[PDB]
């Protein structure tokens, strides 16, 4: 509704004020702020909105960055690969007048050259629950090795 800082709201009112005055002087039409809307005071609403924005919030000055509530998406990389294939083949098909423009999605893969990449996206989405418990561990260095000279030691100035 209202920004913690009313700079945005004030800018809107001033933009309205400046435009109405410019129009009035250019067209030699009446200019009267705080009067009837029909012939003047076209900026009445914006002025009141800024006044309403004056409600503000507690310590608005203390902004704090935050990590996104939503993490990076599950199969975005696979989806991006399929999208690139669809676009590339569309570009080639329109250029060379192929029928590949039609049947962009194909069950067999005979009519779709992007079917395989699509299948990969579908499999990753399908196995999201299946691999939800996956450790993702192979061979992990033990801490003593990890903190030895040539590894993660003396890595931050002033160590």
């Amino acid at each position: 509704s209202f920004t913690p800082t009313c700079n945005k709201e004030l800018t809107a009112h001033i933009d309205c004020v400046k435009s109405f005055l410019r129009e009035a002087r250019t067209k030699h039409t009446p200019y009267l702020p705080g009067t009837g809307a029909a012939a003047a005071d076209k900026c009445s609403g914006s002025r009141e909105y800024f006044a309403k924005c004056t409600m503000y919030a507690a310590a608005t000055t203390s902004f704090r960055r935050t990590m996104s509530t939503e993490m990076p998406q599950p199969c975005e990389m696979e989806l991006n690969l399929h999208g690139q294939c669809v676009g590339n083949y569309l570009t080639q098909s329109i250029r060379t007048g192929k029928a590949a423009a039609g049947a962009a999605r194909g069950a067999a893969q005979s009519e779709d050259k992007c079917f395989l990449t699509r299948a990969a996206f579908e499999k990753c989405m399908m196995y999201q629950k299946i691999t939800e418990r996956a450790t993702n561990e192979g061979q992990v260095e033990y801490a003593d090795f990890s903190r030895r000279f040539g590894r993660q030691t003396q890595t931050t100035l002033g160590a």
Binding site: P72, E76, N80, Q84, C124, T135, N136, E137, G138
Partner: protein, 194 residues
């Protein structure tokens, strides 16, 4: 533990003292990079003019660059506009910042491929090995969604989906498009770009 598995020693043409970069392979490599790698990676330090009269003729490079849209400006009104690309523009970048890129790859950052052909031990061999090094996970290793096993990536688990699939692209010269060819060709091109 041990350091990441060393890449095999591939017999690229340019490895001999009196041998050059095979331009036909570098051209195919540009196609592989533009149609596969570019979706997630950027080559900030590679410009289109670098390819003129070296990989492609000048008119062809103009067409390639003009295919992309860049953000230039400001105009006389202080606004930013979008124009077709030119020979003086760097290769297009898929994401605006590193934080946008990370948000689109499960937190992982697709590294810039400008100097990657020489940024890893093994050099060009590391690119060829990596792209052809995806395998089914070892027994006892289980990988979450979006994590794939690769023998040459440090640790074994890479957030890059296996990028090369047979028939992904059609080479203009007619060379058979198989995963190992695309690998050999994009490795060649990235070596040239470095």
């Amino acid at each position: 533990e041990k350091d990441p598995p060393s890449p095999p020693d591939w017999p690229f043409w340019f490895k001999a003292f009196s041998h050059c970069h095979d331009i036909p392979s570098c051209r195919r490599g540009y196609e592989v990079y533009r149609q596969v790698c570019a979706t997630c990676h950027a080559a900030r330090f590679v410009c289109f003019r670098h390819m003129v009269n070296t990989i492609y003729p000048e008119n062809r490079v103009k067409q390639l660059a003009a295919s992309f849209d860049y953000e230039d400006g400001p105009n006389d009104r202080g606004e930013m506009f979008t124009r077709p690309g030119n020979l003086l523009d760097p290769f297009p970048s898929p994401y605006p910042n590193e934080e946008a890129a990370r948000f689109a790859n499960q937190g992982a950052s697709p590294p810039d491929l400008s100097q990657q052909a020489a940024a890893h031990h093994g050099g060009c061999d590391y690119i060829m090995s990596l792209l052809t090094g995806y395998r089914d996970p070892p027994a006892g290793v289980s990988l979450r969604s979006g994590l794939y096993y690769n023998t040459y990536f440090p640790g074994g688990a890479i957030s890059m989906p296996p990028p090369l699939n047979d028939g992904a692209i059609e080479y203009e010269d007619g060379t058979p498009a198989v995963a190992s060819q695309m690998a050999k060709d994009v490795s060649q091109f990235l070596t040239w770009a470095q």
